[PDB]
């Protein structure tokens, strides 16, 4: 508890006043009641860690401030952390195949958006699950997903909060669909389903913006039709862009931070194996120390 309090005291803990309702620093009276109620229930259930305001408010927002439902969601997450070995994944799991997977499925963080969010990139055009599964498995790619989430939560986001001057809880996602077929997209359905189960249930409220660029015609048409089924708050985070996406990305990410290939000015001597951002700058690294490197 003491080292956790020392960790949280070392970076800004209030969201900007523009932020969504139910976020740290932006609670109304019923939300502040539910937060104290959830904390009391989880302390009685024997939990010690991850009972800070920002964590509990993420589970609350994910369950619309239904305290019993947020309590169940938190407990399921803690049970999964125990069963999956999440608390030691950065020490146990070694993604030695990363340079090989990068040839088929680049996944990488690079710098920050104008709101201070770390920017996560994925490129889908070269995906070949059968070829990838000669050097990895779906189980190991999901292990890498959790490895990256733990690096995000424990190292990237605190440093990003220091660089921004306010709490940063979320990432800006850019997914490049250039070159993918509907058949290849179908082949990664299992991975998308399993990874999204982990995101939703164990990392709630960690997605800040979600850009899909180079969207094919059928895909963007389907999304625009299906959109009413989404939460309007969720809809406001998602941007489905075609071939001309550079001006829209540059509204959200400083040109200095956006990679050249996507319309920006940022260069890397390469990019697919890099992890460049404020969490690599000693000015913004706190008592947690520097993020580990997958490579």
Ligand X SMILES: C[C@@H]1OC(=O)[C@H]2C[C@H]3CCCC[C@H]3[C@H](/C=C/[C@H]3CCC[C@H](C)N3C)[C@@H]12
User: Which member of 191, 219, 272, 284 binds ligand X (CB under 6 A)?
Assistant: 191
Nearer Cβ to ligand X, position 22 or 208?
208
Shortest distance, CB of residue 208 to ligand X, whole angstroms? 6
Q: Which is nearer to ligand X, 38 or 120 (CB)?
A: 120
Within residues 99-128, the interface with ligand X by CB under 6 A covers 120, 122
Q: Where are the alpha helices (DSSP H) in the chain?
A: 2-8, 29-44, 53-62, 67-84, 89-92, 98-101, 129-132, 138-151, 157-164, 182-187, 189-202, 217-226, 232-235, 246-252
Piece of 39-47, 91-99, 146-154, 272-280 that binds ligand X (CB under 6 A): 146-154
Question: What is the 8-class DSSP label of residue 213?
Answer: E
Query: What DSSP designation does 292 have?
Result: P
Per-residue H/E/C for 22-42: CCCCCCCHHHHHHHHHHHHHH
Residue found under tokens 């440093």: 159
Interface with ligand X includes 173 (CB under 6 A)? yes
> Would you give the DSSP letter of residue 156?
I
Q: How near is the Cβ of 141 to ligand X at its closest, in Å?
A: 8
β-strands 238-240, 207-213: how paired? parallel
Please state the closest distance from residue 117 (CB atom) to ligand X, in A: 8
Among 27, 157, 174, 207, binds ligand X (CB under 6 A): 207
Cβ(194)–Cβ(80) below 8 Å: no
Which of residues 56 and 145 has its CB atom nearest to ligand X in the complex?
Answer: 145
Residue span binding ligand X (CB under 6 A) among the ranges 83-91, 157-165, 188-196, 212-220: 188-196
Residues that bind ligand X (CB under 6 A): 120, 122, 145, 148-149, 152, 171, 173, 191-192, 195, 199, 206-208
């Amino acid at each position: 508890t003491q080292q956790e309090k020392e960790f949280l005291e070392s970076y800004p803990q209030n969201c900007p006043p523009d932020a969504l309702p139910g976020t740290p620093g932006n609670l109304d009276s019923a939300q502040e009641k539910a937060l104290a109620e959830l904390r009391k229930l989880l302390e009685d259930a024997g939990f010690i860690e991850r009972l800070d305001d920002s964590t509990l408010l993420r589970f609350l927002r994910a369950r619309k401030f239904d305290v019993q439902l947020a309590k169940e969601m938190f407990e399921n997450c803690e049970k999964w952390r125990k069963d999956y070995g999440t608390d030691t994944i950065l020490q146990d799991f070694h993604y030695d195949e990363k340079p090989l997977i990068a040839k088929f499925y680049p996944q990488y963080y690079h710098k920050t958006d104008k709101d201070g969010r770390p920017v996560y990139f994925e490129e889908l055009g070269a995906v070949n699950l059968h070829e990838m599964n000669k050097v990895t498995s779906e189980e190991r790619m999901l292990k890498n997903l959790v490895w990256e989430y733990e690096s995000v939560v424990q190292y990237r986001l605190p440093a990003c909060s220091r660089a921004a001057g306010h709490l940063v809880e979320t990432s800006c996602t850019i997914m490049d669909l250039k070159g993918i077929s509907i058949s290849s997209a179908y082949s990664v359905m299992s991975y998308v389903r399993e990874a999204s189960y982990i995101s939703q249930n164990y990392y709630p409220e960690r997605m800040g913006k979600f850009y899909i660029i180079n969207a094919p015609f059928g895909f963007s048409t389907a999304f625009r039709l299906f959109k009413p089924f989404l939460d309007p708050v969720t809809v406001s985070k998602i941007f489905i862009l075609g071939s001309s996406y550079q001006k829209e990305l540059l509204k959200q990410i400083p040109a200095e931070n956006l990679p050249v290939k996507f319309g920006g000015k940022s260069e890397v001597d390469g990019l697919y194996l890099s992890d460049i951002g404020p969490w690599r700058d000693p000015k913004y690294i706190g008592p947690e120390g520097e993020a580990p490197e997958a490579f």
